[PDB]
Amino acid sequence: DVNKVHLKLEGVSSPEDIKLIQSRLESVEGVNNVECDTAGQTIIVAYDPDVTGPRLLIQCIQDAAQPPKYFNASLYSPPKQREAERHHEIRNYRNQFLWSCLFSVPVFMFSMVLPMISPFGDWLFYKVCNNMTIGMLLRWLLCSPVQFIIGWRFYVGAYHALKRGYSNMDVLVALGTNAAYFYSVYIVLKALTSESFEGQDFFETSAMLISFILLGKYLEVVAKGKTSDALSKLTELAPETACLLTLDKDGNAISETEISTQLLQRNDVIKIVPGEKVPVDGVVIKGQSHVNESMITGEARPIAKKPGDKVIGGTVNDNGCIIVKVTHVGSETALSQIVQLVEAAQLARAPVQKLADRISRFFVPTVVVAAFLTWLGWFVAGQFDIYPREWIPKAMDSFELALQFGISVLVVACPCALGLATPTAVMVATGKGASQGVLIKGGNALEKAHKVKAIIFDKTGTLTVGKPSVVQTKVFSKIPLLELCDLAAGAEANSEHPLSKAIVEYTKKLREQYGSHSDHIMESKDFEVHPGAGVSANVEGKLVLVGNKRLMQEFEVPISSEVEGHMSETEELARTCVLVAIDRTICGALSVSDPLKPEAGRAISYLSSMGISSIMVTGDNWATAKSIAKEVGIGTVFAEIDPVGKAEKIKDLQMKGLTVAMVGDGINDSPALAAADVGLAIGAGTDVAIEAADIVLMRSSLEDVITAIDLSRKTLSRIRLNYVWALGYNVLGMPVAAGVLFPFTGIRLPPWLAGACMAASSVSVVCSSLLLQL
């Protein structure tokens, strides 16, 4: 913005308006450079960042607004265009595969079914000049579009492997169509020239290979996962407008209008009405209010801000309008750092080299050498005349038979199920995971999650807490349990702290635990709110004392044994983990804190059983992090870690190998969630964490992590087996294609049971969805 702006005119289609805008901009001094892109109806304005402001430029643009349109100038790009791009890709691949089927299925049918079928089987035998048949010509004409027109991708892939020294899936593995087609053309031409030549064409294999490879590409695009990602959520987290605050106070006149935050500059002021999301980072001039800092800290404790403190863009205040002088804006904001980390992580994942490409790299030389060896062997055997002469078919020589047995190896040795292996395991894995409640967006997660050795958990909503709540209550004030809850609710009647509200819901839970919520309470008078001490309030004229020993002494309440037993670590000194909550008399207290685990302990134990270690990287107090690490069992723990520090930890672990996986809950985790090998998000968390991860967990459960890892392990199994079965019949029929059978048996090669092993291979590439991981 302040550095360079792409002012795209809206509703402008004539160069005269652009020229008027150019003249108006040149009439204003301060812009370093004006790039005049006449073609495109857009203009680039570059100038020194952190001076003046785009508001003057926008006003100058708006001064030229004339009918029939309104001349708006701001950077227009099509947002969430990757969804439409994914639809375009899906339509393109589906229609191309459908066209390949429309040309291949007739070839296969006319080749294999009609010859055996009832009277319409001699229609594709009616001879032409010499021994050219109607069937051969029709198969040629139908298959020719498939080999060439739809094969442009394959030929350009082969030409892209010109001298680079590699054999991808678009090399002879898929170009065996090129050999089969040319051999079939040779057969047809010779039948046109020869007089008996009882032979058959191989047009089936080319069309079938093209169809299966296009199906593999289509299914790969389908199983690639949900449409990339969406960094737009990070920007949506920032406010779109801000209240300009040149209002009354000394050198500030009246302003209250809402101006775009992107248009705000340094040395500006925003007040943020209570209950508003702060636009940009700043330093407060005056004002006391609590903010829900979660972009950096990640927790939900209301941080109190007094005059002279700072503020982080994205949070919401609740205790009044807090005027703030604007600090660093734009690319220097903390949210900007988070965003930049996100796209740096996104444009750093090199796509995994498909095992199909590796095989084809180490399979084409094998096939070519094998075919050449068969050709040489039969050529030698014919030139030295070992095998009987009558073995050769009519009108053929030894060299022709050698060529036949050589090209047979090339035709049979065609993967034709290699591209169908990974897609038709990833799809089934994703479906079964969605059934189990583990939605896995992207197959890349499927292949990279099996080798995960380290996992990194987060604390403020990932492993421990859904929302703060009370645990481990004991009788206090030497009063009945129901009337304990009576005191609790009576004290809560005037306090509205988030911990106090959690006490309200937990008291309601106790009430319904005693059969049902018994009636209601009396109002608490004298809501003094003693600083430091806590809530002191006359409940029906009786003073409840939710607060520490100072509040005990201000009402002259004694001290007892447990008073020094239940805080610090979590349950060591000050009688309640995060609060005090004694009420009027002393007999005990409660244990308001964050929840511990619904299952997390056994999940971590099972993860350690499989060898995957766990590391905790939180952004909370050291004491709580140590407490949780001791409780659940995580050894390594890091506290007060910003998202940048999380990314650095991921980078260090990755540099030590041991492909990592982060389980995230909120804004704090997103940089590491994108920077890890695979991202895990808790469904109960916020939208940005759901978006930034690769394996979102539908139901909030740590056991979903082990389900995902187990699913990835079982899909890395049943995929090497899929590759084995895809190599399978082809590599086992390579000897049959070569000819080692004709010396022993009488059959040379069944024309139908030569290409009709790819169907068996395709059926053998089938996966069952029975996980049962417990």
| Chain residues in the site for Mg ion (CB under 5 A) | 298, 458, 460-461, 665
* 773 CB neighbour count, 10 Å cutoff: 14
Q: Express the helix, strand and coil content of the chain in percent, nearest 5 each.
A: 45, 15, 40
Show Cβ contacts of residue 448 under 8 Å, excluding neighbours closer than 6 positions: 352, 659, 677, 678
CB of 459 to Mg ion, least distance (A): 6
Cβ nearer to Mg ion, comparing 107 with 296: 296
Q: Output the CA angle 24-37-59, nearest 5 degrees.
A: 30
CB of 301 to Mg ion, least distance (A): 13
* 91 CB neighbour count, 10 Å cutoff: 10
> Which residues, listed in sequence order, are joined to residue 614 by a DSSP beta bridge?
455
Residue 107's H or E segment, with its range, is helix 81-112
CB of 465 to Mg ion, least distance (A): 8
C-alpha separations of 551 from 343, 486, 767 in Å = 52, 20, 67
Cβ nearer to Mg ion, comparing 294 with 576: 294
In 476-564, which residue ranges form alpha helices assigned H by DSSP?
481-492, 498-513, 549-554
In 437-480, which residue ranges form alpha helices assigned H by DSSP?
443-448
CB of 655 to Mg ion, least distance (A): 25
Tell me the residue type at 473. Answer: T
For 59, counting Cβ atoms within 10 Å of its Cβ (0-12 exposed, 13-18 middle, 19+ buried), the class is: exposed
Is residue 436 a contact partner of residue 708, using CB atoms and an 8 Å limit?
A: no
User: How long, in residues, is the chain?
Assistant: 774
Cα distance between residue 565 and residue 597, in whole Å: 23
User: Which of 238, 183, 180, 233 is closest to 209 using CA atoms?
Assistant: 180
Cα distance between residue 547 and residue 554, in whole Å: 11
Cα distance between residue 671 and residue 296, in whole Å: 11
DSSP 22-70: HHHHHTS---SEEEEETTTTEEEEE--SSSS-HHHHHHHHHTT--TTS-
Query: Phi/psi zone of residue 711: left (φ > 0), alpha (ψ -120 to 50 degrees), beta?
Result: alpha
Q: Catalytic residue, from 170, 229, 458, 710: name it.
A: 458
Q: What are phi and psi of 679, to 5 degrees?
A: -105, 130
Sign of the torsion angle spanned by Cα atoms 753, 757, 759, 763: positive
How do beta strands 678-682 and 695-697 pair?
parallel
Cβ nearer to Mg ion, comparing 459 with 584: 459
* Secondary structure (3-state) at 384: coil
Confirm whether 50 is a catalytic residue.
no
CB of 455 to Mg ion, least distance (A): 15
CB of 466 to Mg ion, least distance (A): 11
Cβ nearer to Mg ion, comparing 213 with 682: 682
CB of 602 to Mg ion, least distance (A): 21
CB of 665 to Mg ion, least distance (A): 4
> Which residues, listed in sequence order, are joined to residue 269 by a DSSP beta bridge?
325
From first CA to last CA, the distance across the chain in angstroms is: 53
User: Whose CB is nearest to Mg ion?
Assistant: 460
CB of 606 to Mg ion, least distance (A): 22
Cα distance between residue 730 and residue 732, in whole Å: 5
CB of 88 to Mg ion, least distance (A): 37
Cβ nearer to Mg ion, comparing 490 with 619: 619
Cβ nearer to Mg ion, comparing 293 with 458: 458
Cβ nearer to Mg ion, comparing 151 with 461: 461
CB of 181 to Mg ion, least distance (A): 59
For 74, counting Cβ atoms within 10 Å of its Cβ (0-12 exposed, 13-18 middle, 19+ buried), the class is: middle
- Which residue shows structure tokens 């998202």? 643
Cβ nearer to Mg ion, comparing 294 with 333: 294
User: Which of 262, 240, 249 is closest to 321 using CA atoms?
Assistant: 249
* 435 CB neighbour count, 10 Å cutoff: 10
Residue 289's H or E segment, with its range, is strand 289-291
Cβ nearer to Mg ion, comparing 176 with 298: 298
247 DSSP assignment: B
CB of 669 to Mg ion, least distance (A): 6
How do beta strands 613-617 and 591-593 pair?
unpaired
Cβ nearer to Mg ion, comparing 265 with 627: 627
CB of 369 to Mg ion, least distance (A): 57
Sheet holding 269-270, edge to edge: 269-270, 323-326, 282-286, 310-311
Is residue 296 a contact partner of residue 640, using CB atoms and an 8 Å limit?
A: no
Cβ nearer to Mg ion, comparing 422 with 460: 460
The residues annotated as belonging to the active site are 458
